[PDB]
Design a protein around this nucleic acid. Structure first.
Lengths: 98, 136, 62, 25, 213
RNA sequence: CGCAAGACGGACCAGAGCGAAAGCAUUUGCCAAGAAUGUUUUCAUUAAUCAAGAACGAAAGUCGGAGGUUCGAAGACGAUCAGAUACCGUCGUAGUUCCGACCAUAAACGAUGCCGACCGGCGAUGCGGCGGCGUUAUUCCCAUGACCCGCCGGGCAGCUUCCGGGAAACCAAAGUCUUUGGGUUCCGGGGGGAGUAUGGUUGCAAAGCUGAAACUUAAAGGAAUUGACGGAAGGGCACCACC
RNA sequence: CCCAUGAACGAGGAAUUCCCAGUAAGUGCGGGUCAUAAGCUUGCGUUGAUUAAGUCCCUGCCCUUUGUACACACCGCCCGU
């Protein structure tokens, strides 16, 4: 039986979308279908923002962040626990989780 | 092995190209140019096992041996050009990244501009693994 | 580096694999407005004094 | 027996019938 | 059994006079031991210098390439080779739910230096904008792109390599474009993300020495 | 630091747009094309759907050139394994790319023919038009952009409702059906045998289009419920569990 | 019961059991068996701690959500040579 209205993916009036490669695996996945997750992330977490800022030649030097748009294979994503299975009620929730 | 620098005030800068892939970590200090090298030691040099070439310890222990050698040659400070594998493969730097930075800062050196120089492309050649990818 | 004393000002919860370490905020005895989160192995209530072989290490919040 | 492989088997079986039929020509 | 850093000679590096903080850093070379000269083996050396360790105190995310055209004696005399933006900044600017607008201009200064100036622009979500998207039409994009190319030609073709670097330092081209293109689509995060040399003219020694007092 | 070649067009990139479908993403120019809106323009039934016939038709595959970066059917190894002609790894020919000629098939899917009428509500979005306080730019007014608040048409959608339908899942269409007739094309008739044999036809080939019978069979199947089960996800308890 | 003989055993590999207060462990004494009769069990005192007041890491079990072609139900069904 038809599980999703939007057949997993997000194309409505296309017919074809360019595929991307899942990052964990490397499997050809349609762009709209893929679980895209954008990650801004400090080059050092907490243990080193203490130590590196102390040895900062500078005075009041902000650190850079690392900007990587991850794509994911549906298997890629669920094994990596990015997306969980939800109840047939809670499948219809599209709001990104708090 | 002496950069004849003005007693204290001068920080003599290098640049440690930290290439942290997911099965090795390279700490490699050069001049401001990049065209002349000072010291390279990688994770796999300082561990007797292929398993822990990637390791954050290996990266730490290499970065310490970099710092040791860079004290001698009269480099006070470094700039950091952190690098992941890049191209059609991952943009994310492996687990040796943080430990290496933390290490060489923690183990003597002074730190200038950190930035990512991970090789990224407009559109790539086809990635390793098939249609269906790396099935396991 | 010296060995700094610290005061258990709030016991937060419980960390570790087997729930083997309480997580705690420790008010430093020198700087009475430095309060860091630190993992403690063994029974601890409010106000007992922990000896830290370094104060630069810091526990991740559960 | 996946239906694609049943077809492939039956397709290669048909290819071995335009071999035994190709001798009388 | 012999340390190769025993053979090395520590040259100081000097940036041209348009910049405020003069000396950059150090560069070790092999001593002229035989045929190949240290001065000869110290020419095509790109120095990837951040601006805030090149001016007094300006925006830091901008970099500059300086190559050692001439080597006098414990002084690597360098010349502008190409401005670039920090991946940190360039990535931070690229947000979803707005139109990116890139341009690029093959251009020549009054002195025979040939440049490829790459501009980038981003449409601004307005003060009271309740609608989520902030996208241009395609004609809006290409009219903006046409003004970017018009301005980058207009402010490189007319004057020398020395002046155009003195324009690239504070933010002349990036801000002039953003003032010009408000009437087409109001865009906000406008920079000249990259500059690169294509043809340097035949090197005149006194022309570099001009840029070092 | 350069040089060369060939692929590919990240991020921007959306349940966004365009296209009959397949499909389509660097810049700029040329070329014809196109829907939608606007219209107190024109022709005046010219129309809807369609045996025959026809155009386009992913990928793979075939023939003759050009090129061969990456990736990689076959193959050579290296592991895992009881075996492992597989999953994993290193090489790797055809191929992947371009040109000319085939081939005409895909879960070519919205698994939903096209045209037309009618029957709910809601806020969005894309295109055009029309109207309305205000802010901003070309500042020197305009008028145009950018927001803002509405309305109209056309489109891709979404949420919601005891419209109604349906075996249900679900569908503003899959409704307006025993209260059964708006027009029309294709097409199904229990499961297998079988998309097989055979004949024709198209193709260089691989194959495609048309396509049975004997025989065999009491079920095969659809949706949903409960349970058990999982080498799925999360929560909880226990010194017959751990610390 | 008496006298003699006086073995391995010097703290136990892989693994694994039991247990938070009068508890574990040490120590004896009753009951059952019993003509004869405790290295067993079932009770009873006596002496009396270490550690813990935790968690879901391991092992089980239980829920909730999911998937299923399973329903004497995964020791299930099941495909080809």
């Amino acid at each position: 039986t038809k599980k999703r209205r939007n057949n997993g993916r997000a194309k409505k009036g296309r017919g074809h979308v360019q595929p991307i490669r899942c990052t964990n695996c490397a499997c050809c996945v349609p762009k709209d279908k893929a679980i895209k997750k954008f990650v801004i992330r400090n080059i050092v977490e907490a243990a080193a923002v203490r130590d590196i800022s102390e040895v900062s030649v500078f005075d009041a030097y902000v650190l850079p962040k690392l900007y990587v748009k991850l794509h994911y294979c549906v298997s890629c994503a669920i094994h990596s626990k990015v997306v969980r299975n939800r109840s047939r009620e809670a499948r219809k929730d599209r709001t990104p989780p708090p | 092995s002496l950069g004849p620098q003005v007693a204290e005030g001068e920080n003599v800068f290098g640049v440690c190209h930290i290439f942290a892939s997911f099965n090795d970590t390279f700490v490699h200090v050069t001049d401001l140019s990049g065209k002349e090298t000072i010291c390279r030691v990688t994770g796999g040099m300082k561990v007797k096992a292929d398993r822990d070439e990637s390791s954050p310890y290996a990266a730490m222990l290499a970065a310490q041996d970099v710092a040791q050698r860079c004290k001698e040659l009269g480099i006070t400070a470094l700039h950091i050009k952190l690098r992941a594998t890049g191209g059609n493969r991952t943009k994310t730097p492996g687990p040796g990244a943080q430990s290496a930075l933390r290490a060489l800062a923690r183990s003597g050196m002074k730190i200038g501009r950190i930035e990512d120089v991970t090789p990224i492309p407009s559109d790539s050649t086809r990635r390793k693994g098939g249609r269906r990818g790396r099935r396991l | 580096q010296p060995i700094k004393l610290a005061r258990v000002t709030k016991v937060l919860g419980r960390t570790g694999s087997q729930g083997q370490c309480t997580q705690v905020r420790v008010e430093f005895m020198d700087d009475t407005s430095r309060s860091i989160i630190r993992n403690v192995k063994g029974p601890v209530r409010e106000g007992d004094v922990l000896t830290l072989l370094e104060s630069e290490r810091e526990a991740r919040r559960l | 027996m996946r239906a694609k492989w049943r077809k492939k088997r039956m397709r290669r079986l048909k290819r071995k019938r335009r071999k035994m039929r190709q001798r009388s020509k | 059994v012999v340390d190769p850093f025993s053979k090395k000679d520590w040259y100081d590096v000097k940036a041209p006079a348009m910049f405020n903080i003069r000396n950059i850093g150090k560069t070790l070379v092999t001593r002229t031991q035989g045929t190949k000269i240290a001065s000869d083996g110290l020419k095509g050396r790109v120095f990837e210098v951040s601006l805030a360790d090149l001016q007094n105190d300006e925006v830091a995310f901008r970099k500059f390439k300086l190559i050692t055209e001439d080597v006098q004696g414990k002084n690597c005399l360098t010349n502008f080779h190409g401005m670039d933006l920090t991946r940190d900044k360039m990535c931070s600017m690229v947000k979803k739910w707005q139109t990116m607008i890139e341009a690029h201009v093959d251009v020549k200064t009054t002195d025979g230096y040939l440049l490829r100036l790459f501009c980038v622009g981003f449409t601004k979500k307005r003060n009271n904008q309740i609608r989520k998207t902030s996208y241009a039409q395609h004609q809006q994009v290409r009219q903006i792109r046409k003004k970017m190319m018009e301005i980058m030609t207009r402010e490189v073709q007319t004057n020398d390599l020395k002046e155009v670097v003195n324009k690239l330092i504070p933010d002349s081209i990036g801000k002039d474009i953003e003032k010009a293109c408000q009437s087409i689509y109001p865009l906000h995060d406008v920079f000249v993300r990259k500059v690169k040399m294509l043809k340097k003219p035949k090197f005149e020694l006194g022309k570099l020495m001009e840029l070092h007092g």
